[PDB]
Structures are given as structure tokens and as C-alpha cells.
Design a protein around this nucleic acid. Sequence first.
RNA 1: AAUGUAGGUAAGGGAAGUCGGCAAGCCGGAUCCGUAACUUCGGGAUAAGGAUUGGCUCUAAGGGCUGGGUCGGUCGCGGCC
RNA 2: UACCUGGUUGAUCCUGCCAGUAGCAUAUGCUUGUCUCAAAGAUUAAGCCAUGCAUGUCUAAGUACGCACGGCCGGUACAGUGAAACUGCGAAUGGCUCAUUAAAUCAGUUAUGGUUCCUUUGGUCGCUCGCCACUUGGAUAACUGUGGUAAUUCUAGAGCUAAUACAUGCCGACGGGCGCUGACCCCCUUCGCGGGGGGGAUGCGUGCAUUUAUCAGUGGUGACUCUAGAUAACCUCGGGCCGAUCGCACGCCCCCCGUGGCGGCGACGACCCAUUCGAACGUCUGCCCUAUCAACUUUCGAUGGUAGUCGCCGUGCCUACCAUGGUGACCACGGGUGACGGGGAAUCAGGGUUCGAUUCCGGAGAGGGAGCCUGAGAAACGGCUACCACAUCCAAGGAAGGCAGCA
RNA 3: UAGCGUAUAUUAAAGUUGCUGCAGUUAAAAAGCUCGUAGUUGGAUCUUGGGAGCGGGCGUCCCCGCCCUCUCGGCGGGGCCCGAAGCGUUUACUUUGAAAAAAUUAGAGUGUUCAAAGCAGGCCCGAGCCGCCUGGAUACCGCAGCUAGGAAUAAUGGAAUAGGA
RNA 4: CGCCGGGCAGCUUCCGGGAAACCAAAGUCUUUGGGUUCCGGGGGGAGUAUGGUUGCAAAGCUGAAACUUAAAGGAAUUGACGG
RNA 5: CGUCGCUACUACCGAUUGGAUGGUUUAGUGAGGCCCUCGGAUCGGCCCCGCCGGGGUGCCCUGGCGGAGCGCUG
Lengths: 262, 153, 206
Amino acid sequence: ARGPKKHLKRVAAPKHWMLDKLTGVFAPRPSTGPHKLRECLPLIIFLRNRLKYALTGDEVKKICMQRFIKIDGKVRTDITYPAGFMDVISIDKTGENFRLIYDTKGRFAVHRITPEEAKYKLCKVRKIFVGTKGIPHLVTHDARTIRYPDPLIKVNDTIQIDLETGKITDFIKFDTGNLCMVTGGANLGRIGVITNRERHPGSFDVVHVKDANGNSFATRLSNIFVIGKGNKPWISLPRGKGIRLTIAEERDKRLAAKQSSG
Amino acid sequence: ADIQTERAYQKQPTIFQNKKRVLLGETGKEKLPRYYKNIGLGFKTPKEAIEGTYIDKKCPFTGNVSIRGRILSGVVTKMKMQRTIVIRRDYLHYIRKYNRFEKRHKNMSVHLSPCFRDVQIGDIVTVGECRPLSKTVRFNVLKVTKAAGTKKQ
Amino acid sequence: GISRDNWHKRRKTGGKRKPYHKKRKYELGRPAANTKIGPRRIHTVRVRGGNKKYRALRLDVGNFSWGSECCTRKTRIIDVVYNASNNELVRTKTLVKNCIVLIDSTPYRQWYESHYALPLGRKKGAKLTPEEEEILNKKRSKKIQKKYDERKKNAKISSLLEEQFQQGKLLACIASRPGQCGRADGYVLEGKELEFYLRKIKARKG
RNA sequence: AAUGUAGGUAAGGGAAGUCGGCAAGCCGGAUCCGUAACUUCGGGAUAAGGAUUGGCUCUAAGGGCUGGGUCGGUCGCGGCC
RNA sequence: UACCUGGUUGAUCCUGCCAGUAGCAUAUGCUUGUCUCAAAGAUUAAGCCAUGCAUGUCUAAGUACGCACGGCCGGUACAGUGAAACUGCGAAUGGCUCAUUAAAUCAGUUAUGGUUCCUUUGGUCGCUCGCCACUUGGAUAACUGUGGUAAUUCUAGAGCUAAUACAUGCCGACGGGCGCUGACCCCCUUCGCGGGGGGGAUGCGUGCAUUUAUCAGUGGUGACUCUAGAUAACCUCGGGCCGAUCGCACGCCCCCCGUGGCGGCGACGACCCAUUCGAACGUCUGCCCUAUCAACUUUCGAUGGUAGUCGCCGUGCCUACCAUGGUGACCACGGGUGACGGGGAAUCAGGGUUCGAUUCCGGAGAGGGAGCCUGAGAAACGGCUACCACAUCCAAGGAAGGCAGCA
RNA sequence: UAGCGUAUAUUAAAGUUGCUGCAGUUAAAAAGCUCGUAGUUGGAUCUUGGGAGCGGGCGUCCCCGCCCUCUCGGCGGGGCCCGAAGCGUUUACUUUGAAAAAAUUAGAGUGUUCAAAGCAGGCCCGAGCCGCCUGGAUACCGCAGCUAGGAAUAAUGGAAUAGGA
RNA sequence: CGCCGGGCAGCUUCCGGGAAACCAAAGUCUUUGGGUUCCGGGGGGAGUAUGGUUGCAAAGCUGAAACUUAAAGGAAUUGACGG
RNA sequence: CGUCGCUACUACCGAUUGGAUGGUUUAGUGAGGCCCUCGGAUCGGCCCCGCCGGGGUGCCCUGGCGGAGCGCUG
Ligand SMILES: [Mg+2]
Ligand SMILES: [Mg+2]
Ligand SMILES: [Mg+2]
Ligand SMILES: [Mg+2]
Ligand SMILES: [Mg+2]
Ligand SMILES: [Mg+2]
Ligand SMILES: [Mg+2]
Ligand SMILES: [Mg+2]
Ligand SMILES: [Mg+2]
Ligand SMILES: [Mg+2]
Ligand SMILES: [Mg+2]
Ligand SMILES: [Mg+2]
Ligand SMILES: [Mg+2]
Ligand SMILES: [Mg+2]
Ligand SMILES: [Mg+2]
Ligand SMILES: [Mg+2]
Ligand SMILES: [Mg+2]
Ligand SMILES: [Mg+2]
Ligand SMILES: [Mg+2]
Ligand SMILES: [Mg+2]
């Protein structure tokens, strides 16, 4: 190509978007933003396929342009704005708030939250550097950068960013024994406790995490988001508590649900 | 040999040589300080690189190169080029149809710092990937081990 | 045009490579700046990303730093005396990144008397009386004299730099890249580097 | 003056002249490339074919002779250990 | 479903091929009532193309004195709807085809501590001491009028008129601080000298970005010649930033008074940093047939060294000076391919054998080459320039082309 | 059987390309003979059995416990413990984990009226349900690269002028 | 008269193999894997053409295709025939 | 079984310094673009200043013709 691409084929779209095949040839193609397009949920499919508030891209465009969609405390009129991980979606006209969190199957779930919980938001710091006049800076997992953080905050820690101010209220150090969530790879969406961290210089650090039920897995360091102090989460966990259960104990859960409902 | 064998003045860019020779500096004799660094990954910088006098802008320890990427190894084949050698890596390629392997090899031209003085053909050199140093050179010798030697008859 | 591709070269084995595409723009080259000495002339070229590059076609001044004395002044370049790459660059007086040139030592001398109050470059004195007579005495007080006489002791200049100051021209090595930044900054040669380049020049001629 | 003998030049064509390219003409030195069939493997071969060549101002490279003392511990401004 | 059958003999056991047998994938012949999906000028010609379409775009929020309409509410800069035009953005995506291409493309892996990056998002935008600022200058569109040519999305002359176009350029913060220079003065061991400090008048530079040189060692990597500090200076007239911009409701202070000063929400904009989309060259391993291709590369870069040039950057990318290297029976090099690579497809005991022009990813190309302008991004072709080959119009002076886009 | 024939490429049949897995006296076939470098392949040998309780039931089955060192043990000076450093070779091998686009393949669910498909759908509605419950799994993905266990097999080394620990 | 080792062989054997003739190797092969080299793929065209290379020459080594063909062959049995 | 004779078909050798069509290149000529050094058809500013003018009072605040300063300049 002679320049950047601005189309996204329907079948080449990310799997977790859960887009079918027969509805179209193209995919939303999210605009550039705080999150990469591989792990973002554009508002068009969030409001058309996850909530069914809209039947068409035109209807979700009307909803967006009427300025009801507030993301992270700011109104976004972009139809294809990349929402991403744990950005608070706020609709004040219908009076509910959403937190965008992966489920046990590594897909963004429709997670409803109270306004007082929605007022804050967790972020994973991605780099800490000192800039001119000796001013410390902090770049989170979003594109959000802030000045003058707590000097105790190190790389790949978690910070509590209260909305409408953007400042830090609290933070969780990346330490052994802290509740985390996997934000990439096969274990995407699994909640557990940091148990071990082996570090390979010149390469990727591998962290071993054990969940509540005792199923211990591992993942790369860059795919980890600390979400709680020790074991109590600082956010509202979705249904299933991020406990991935295999198909063997999923099928009988389905059968028990059918028996109870029938 | 003296290190000034080139048309230009060979020197380490980081070190400043003309540090104001004055009365408090007892001249002579003041030894010129040497710039060196540890290259990480557990490799220890050799004493010859610590306290030699050679100038090599491509030396992993006293030059402007950073070691990152792949760390691999080979066997010294020829030492005929200036400051660089060629090594042979021997590997087995798997052919599925016959369930058997195939003896293959590749030659790699790697840069050899002068801090490694007793390097002979047949020795095992651990090399690390760096930025392209020449058209065919992308690796630096980080460690040298003898091949059943450590003695002469 | 002029291309900086790697695919037009032979393979390491010596085999001839065939191109799988025509020339692309991002692998382009541009004609050399070939910076001369004269009245200032700087052209501007647009480069990749919309950024700016300065082709210094002619330069006559440059910012050169002493280093040992930490005095950095904007002086005048007289001519090129040696070049490690090509002798033709010396002959055509082409200013490149590592060629050594002759620069005016007037600002360095001015700083030397204004800082140490010693005759540098003078032969017999009494030749600039409305200024040198002031800058030698200044009729200054006890504390200022205590500063100056303390600074006297380490006011030693190497005999090579002293000879150059007597001649009025220092020889200094460029450090910037004219034709990329459009300026000819550099540093004054001194010490073993100075002796090396002096011997190179003397072996070249004489 | 003719005609000769010896020497030149000639537009356009280029052996149509003539028994016959006879005669004349072309080529030509040196440097750098590059050279076929065939062959008794030595040759063919300066094959064939192509490029360069002035003046002036420079820049490199290719050598030969001498001498390298740490010194009054001294007197044959100089000589032995 | 891990399968066989006929044919050499007068007859028999074999070897062995021929033929049968089943599938899919192209064509074709005959036939064809319903219905659901659905390939479809790849194979030969990446051959040639008439005609038509395929890329344009406006919000309250850049510029409306078009009468082209229209509220005027009537003494008013501009109500409003708005053609055209300037400006900005896009046209570098998409679509098509598979000719070239055999460590090349491409696949997995890994790096950019060796680079650039429109837009989005987030930082940063009184950090600089330095007779218009209650707002500076000129031009040009659109528009009127005069034309030329046979022709074109060709344009000339003349006369107006705007800016978030193009330039120019302050105030404010601003009180000072800091670092050098330091007139002199004061307190001082006082003592006949030296004194150890305090002030300081006058001068010169101060911020971010750039380009050098030097010093020291707030945060970070496995590892910086990292980041952040301090010093000396630079800072390119085709020359960095340090807002002369546009809408929406409209309110507060009035001592000084009485016309001034304050205000909220936006939009646009920016030098720089981060992020996102990427891109580019790199690392490791992997490709079909061929020896009736065994030695290649190296003057004219082949392998490496030193210093540069150029490039967005690392690198023989190129140049100069050196070294004589580099690759090969573990198949180099050369040649062929009816070769774009891969995900995949057919067949199906297991192992394999063939096929992948073809909707997804990556690459290449736009009749063949080549060279460029603009722009963040193109060596662009529904952009330009030139040559070659085809080819349109012509009043023979010229002018205009590119369906491997959809038909 | 609304399909069937023919031509052609290719697959199976073909154990008539044979790695699995063919042959070579006479059917086609082992060089006239020997040496010989690449290539390929290479003899044997270094830890075995004794232990206690959970134990494929000491139930003389045995899930199984096994009867490396040194550094601040983060619960300049405590036994209330587990973290900073190295591996008394280097590998191949095997197992695990990570990271490996989707579609296609296998395969879970789902009466598309059945199916090829698709990724949907289902529960009540007594009419007020001013709405409830779900799914959009999982597997494979060679080779090369990364990580952690095992140490049989295979290669490779350590002390012989001791230049050894 | 015996024993052992290495040979050239012979007789015999339902070891076993083989299409059989036969073979103690031509056995230890669908119960298929000790290491390794060369080499065959129906019969002809053809060991021909061409290229290369060796040779004084004769020739040696390497070595196709077009085309043609349904058999050509091996071992045994019965018969017919045999100067 | 082979020569010879006839008829077909397929290849081979072969004078013809054969012929045709591709591809890759030496050399010569060489469009066009880009860069550099010049170039300066034109278009502007200041010095305007032959002058009427002139106001803080011949000493211009400049409101226009005008020569042209026949220079400095973009
Ligand atoms: Mg003539
Ligand atoms: Mg003539
Ligand atoms: Mg004749
Ligand atoms: Mg005649
Ligand atoms: Mg003659
Ligand atoms: Mg001849
Ligand atoms: Mg000449
Ligand atoms: Mg092709
Ligand atoms: Mg393909
Ligand atoms: Mg494609
Ligand atoms: Mg292209
Ligand atoms: Mg742009
Ligand atoms: Mg083009
Ligand atoms: Mg088959
Ligand atoms: Mg067979
Ligand atoms: Mg035979
Ligand atoms: Mg051998
Ligand atoms: Mg063994
Ligand atoms: Mg063998
Ligand atoms: Mg045969």
C-alpha cells in the first residue's frame, strides 16, 4: 500500500467483536484512539450488537450525534471510537453506566455499574519518565499521560483515576499476592492472584497466577492488569468472577439451567 | 603496535582527553581513562576490554553498539578479515516425509573485538545480535571458549 | 533518481539479485551538499515526514568550542587544511563532518585576557594601548585581585596552542554535518590529537 | 600551351570500371577493455570489435645516505672504563 | 470400506505394463418440472478498446455586497436560505489482475537502545524580562466587461472585492529571580600589613525546540553515548514555537464613577512529548526442477576496516584511502518454471501425491521503461513530464490518450 | 437418475517410486577390482538397592515422602522462615506452559419446515411482560523461536609436561 | 586317531525362503528397520542423436527425445520335432 | 534374420559465414526531470523631494501632479 489502510474486512475483524459473516463485507474499522484496534470495542457495535439500542449504523450515528454517549466523563460523537478496557460508558438519558471488562471467554461483557463506582476508573501505568524542568510523568495503558504522580508508583502498577479531574487518588503496586486480570493471550479475562514472576532479561517476563479455585496458569507480564489489593478487587467483577470453567463443567451447568427453567 | 594507524585520529568519543594539564596534575604520567560498559545478559566484560588501548567503535564493550535480540553461537571458521571473522553454525533440518533429519549449515560474518586476542579456528564463540555493522555483519562476539585446548604442546 | 536501496547490490554469495519492484520514493538519495567557504548560502530541502533539512552550500562562520577552557565562540573559518577521507576535499576547500579547518582565534584570545589577564598571542606589547592598558590593570580592589591572582596559577597554555595563537589562527575539527544541519560547529584541536594532525599536515607538505 | 613523368585534392554514388579492386585509398603508435570457428593444444591473435590520447595546475605511490645514548664519576670546553 | 478385474501360454506359476474402476475440475454433447445456496474472460492475449459511470466534500462554529430567493420594520456592517469561488480535507483507501519475482516475495519469530508517522486521544500553549494591539499590509478569486482559437475541464487583457488564504507585528504576564561582571561600601583577626564574610550601583546572557563542546551523577533498562540536570555559545531571511481566528446563550463589578474592566460553554489552531493507525529496513528457520549448470564474486563494490557523503534512520547506499577477502558437492553460481507467497483445496488406513490466478493476509503492476510535483504518506498513473509501441480529432497551425475499475 | 455420456489434468487403485514399504542369480537390474575424501553409521563402561505416613489397597499394590550450594531468611545480630546470586559442562530428546488473525477443517449448542447452511435463539404474555433467560464454545495449527520439569538414550567436554581441585 | 581357527569346496536336510529352477544362503521379510555403497521401473527407438570430456587412433565415460508397440520376457509342464 | 526394391510416417546430419522471434548486455548518440552555478524579461519598497504645500510655528504634521534617486534594495 502507498499509505495507511482505512478499511476493515468483516472476516478479518477481531474475533471478540462476535461479528457474523452474512451481514456485510466490512467491519467498523475503529478510529485511532487510546486503545489498539485488536482489543477495542467500537461504539457502533457496542450499541448495535451488545445492547441492541440501534438496528443500523445510521441509528447508532443518530444516538451518538444527539450527545448521549459519555465515555470516561466526556461526550464522544465518533461512531467508531475505540472504547477499550474498563472505560466507563455513561448514558445519562437512560440512566445507567457500563464498565467494559472482558468475560471468562475473553470477550467484552455488558457489565452494568452504579454511578458512584463509575465515577472512578483503574489504569495500568505503561511508562514513567522525567521530562523537562525535572517534571515526572506517567503514561497509563490508555494514551493518558499525567504529571506529578506519586514517586512510589513504578512501571506496570495500577492507579485509580477519578473522572472529571484525571488525577490519582490511590494506587496498587505490582506485588506478589495481588489480584490481577489477564488482558491478552489465551487466558484473557481470568481473575486471579499474582503468585510468581520469573523474569528473563532481554525478553518477556512470565507471571504465574492462581485463581480462586486453584487453577494456576501463566502469562506474559505485558498482559496483566492488577485490579485489587491482595484479593479484594477495586472494581465490580462481572458474572463468573473471571473464573474460567472448562466445557465439561459448562455443559452440566447448561443442563441444570434447562432443568430449572423448564 | 600503536593505535593511531588511520588517517583520522582514533579515539573514544565519550572520553575527553585534554583535561587542562595544570600544576595540580603531575605530568607525567597520567593514564588516559577508558570508556567501557557491561553489556547485560550476564556477560562479563573482559579485562583486556577494561584496560586495553585499542579503539573499536563496533566493540560491544568499548564501542557504540547495543546487544539486543538473539543470542546464539557458532564455531570459528576463518579469521582473514579486519576486526571480523566468519563462523559456521551447524543444525539439523527435519524432513517430515522420511521422519529423518538433514545436516545443514550457515556461515555468518561476525565482528570480533580486539579484546579477544587468543581466538583460533575451531573455537566456540557466543555472539549477540546488534544493529547492521556492515553489509553482511549483524552480530558481535560476546564470548569465546576454547575447543579442547587451553594448552600447547 | 539516486537510490539508496540494498537490492541493487550483489548477494553475499556473489549471485546477482533481481529486483521485485521498481524504485520507491522512501529509498531515495539526494546530491551532495559539497559545502564551500564563502558568504552564507543555505538552501532548504523538504524531507520524509515533512521535516526540514538545511543544505549549507557555503559557510564562513562556525561555533567552535575550546573544551579545555570551556570557552565556546562563533568564529570565522579561513580554510580547510586536512581531510581524512579525501585530499580533493582539502584542495576544493569542502567543509565536511570531520575535516579540520583554520579558524580565527580572536574571540578565544579576547576571552583569555578578559578571564585571566595574560598576554596571549602578543609579541612585544604596547600595540593596543587604549584597551590593553585597561585590561591589564583595571585598578581593581583587593578581593578582585585575589580572584585574578588565584586564577593566574593555572593559566598555562600548551606551546602548540601558543604558537597557533601567535600565528593568529587556530586549527579545529568540525563536529556537525553541513548539508544536514546547515552549520559548521566544532571543537578546537589540542593535545595528542593536535600533534597527530600537525604531523599529518607536515608529512603531507614539508 | 598541349602531351607526359612524379605528387595532391575532388560534390553525389561507391567497383557500376576492369580478364582481374591493377593502381590508389582505408587501417595503423600507445593505454584500457574485449577476442570466434578451428587446432598437431603450441597456435589462430595486433583475431574481429570498442573506448581513450592535447595543454595547464596539482595529488599520491614506487628510493638512497648518514646519525639514534643514561651521564665532568672529569683534563686525554675533549679523550679510556 | 486398509478392495481389485480382463489381456502374453496348448495349458500353469510369475515379472510386468496396457486396459478396466472410483473421486474432483475444466470443457463439451444429450436432456431438464420445483426449490434453497452459489462459481463465473484465471488458463490462450499483463492483447486492443468506442460510449456511459466509477471521488468528492459544509457545520451554529474559515471567507457571501450573485438577486438567485427572501424576513426588512424603514434608517440598519452582517436576519435568514444560499449558487459560484477562495480555503481546509480527501483523492496514497477501495476495486482489478498475477506479468515480473526462487532466501527474492511470503510464513512463523524477534529488533528498531538504528527511524519516521496525517488523524484520534492525553499532556504543553503568561515558564522567555525583550504614535495599530480596541486588531497591521498587499494581492487574488468568485463577479462586470473586452476577446483569441476549428478544437480542450485552454485561457489573456482590463476593473473591483474578502480570509483560519498570503504575509507583518506588538502589548500583557513583568514584580523580579538566576548566573557571570563587578563601582564602591560595611562588619570583621584588626595592627604596622595581610584579613573572613556581608551587601551592592553599572553592564551581558536567561524559556522550550536546534547544533556543538564541557562537567556532575531526579528517575529507568539486562544493557545508553538514556532521561532529567549544570556550563560555554549557536539558533540557518526559500529563516521553529512563543494564537492579529470563528460561533452560543448572555451575565458581574462599579468606589475610581458612567465607559471601562471581568467573565461560562465550545470550535479552529499549534513547536514539542506521549498514544493510536501504521510504515521501512533488519534477526533466526523454511521453497519446486535442473550438473548435457562446478566453480562463482571482485577493473565498473565483490568481503571487511577507517573517515566521510547521502538517506527518516543502521548498513558499500555512495565516495576516498587501505586489506584480499566473501560463497560453494551440507549443491554455490547459472538455467527453467505452463512459479505471485501463505491461510488453504482435491484424494484419503497410516505415510503421502497433486493443486492453490480466485473474495482473507502480504507483495507487485497499471501498454513498456524511466524521471518527478504535491502531500504525513505516491516514484501515484480514473497526477504530471519525456521516449518507444498503438491510437483519437484536425480548418494540417495544433490538441488530446491509457477499462489488469463497473458494465 | 434430473441427471447421464465423452475428452483432458490430477488423486486413489500404485507395495508399478516403496520413509512406512518394492526390487537387483535366471524376469530390467551389483560398478572388472582395490584404495579413498566429503556423506552416512559407529563396541562395552560412571547411581543400585536399601527408607517412614498419608500410599496406582507397611496394607512387604504403593497416590507417593526421596531416607544443590549460600545470602538480607521481610513472618550487625531470635527458632516464629522462605528471598537477592550461581549451576559441580554444552546439546539433541520428551512433557508442560506461553505466544501463535479470521475464514476453512474437526467439533459443542441450536428443529433452516429437514438438509447444505446460518449464528442464532428460547421463557412466559393470564394484555401491560410499562420484559426475562442465554449462545456466539473447544480442539488442531507442522518446522524454527520462548519458558519450566525429567535425565533413560545419543553426542560433547573436566586432572597426564598437572598450567589440577 | 582326534580337537581348534581361517580358507576352497562337497553331500544331505519339511531351518527357512522362492514364480520355480534352486539357495545353508538367494534364510533369519506383511511377525516387513544391524550399518552402508551402487543400481532397475513394460518392449523397442537406443546405449542411438546432440553437447561435454578422455584418447595418436580405434574408441571409452556421461547420455536424450520424437516416434512405435500389447506385449516382450522368466521358471517349470504336456506334446510335437531333432541332419 | 538381414541386405535390396516400392509406399508412408518420425526424428538426425548437412553447404547455405541459412532465416525468424524473444531475452540480456558492451559501446556510441541521447529526450526529460531533479540538483548546482549563473541569468535577470518583469513586478514592488526606500532614497520621494521640479512643487505647490506647511504646523507643533525660511524651520512641512502631509493631504496630489510631477520629474525621476537614474542609487539602495526585495
Ligand atoms: Mg568523390
Ligand atoms: Mg563523398
Ligand atoms: Mg564488373
Ligand atoms: Mg563491363
Ligand atoms: Mg595494390
Ligand atoms: Mg583470421
Ligand atoms: Mg585532459
Ligand atoms: Mg507467471
Ligand atoms: Mg494465491
Ligand atoms: Mg490481495
Ligand atoms: Mg505501484
Ligand atoms: Mg496533508
Ligand atoms: Mg507511474
Ligand atoms: Mg492415481
Ligand atoms: Mg516392481
Ligand atoms: Mg537380465
Ligand atoms: Mg570417509
Ligand atoms: Mg555406544
Ligand atoms: Mg550396510
Ligand atoms: Mg524401459
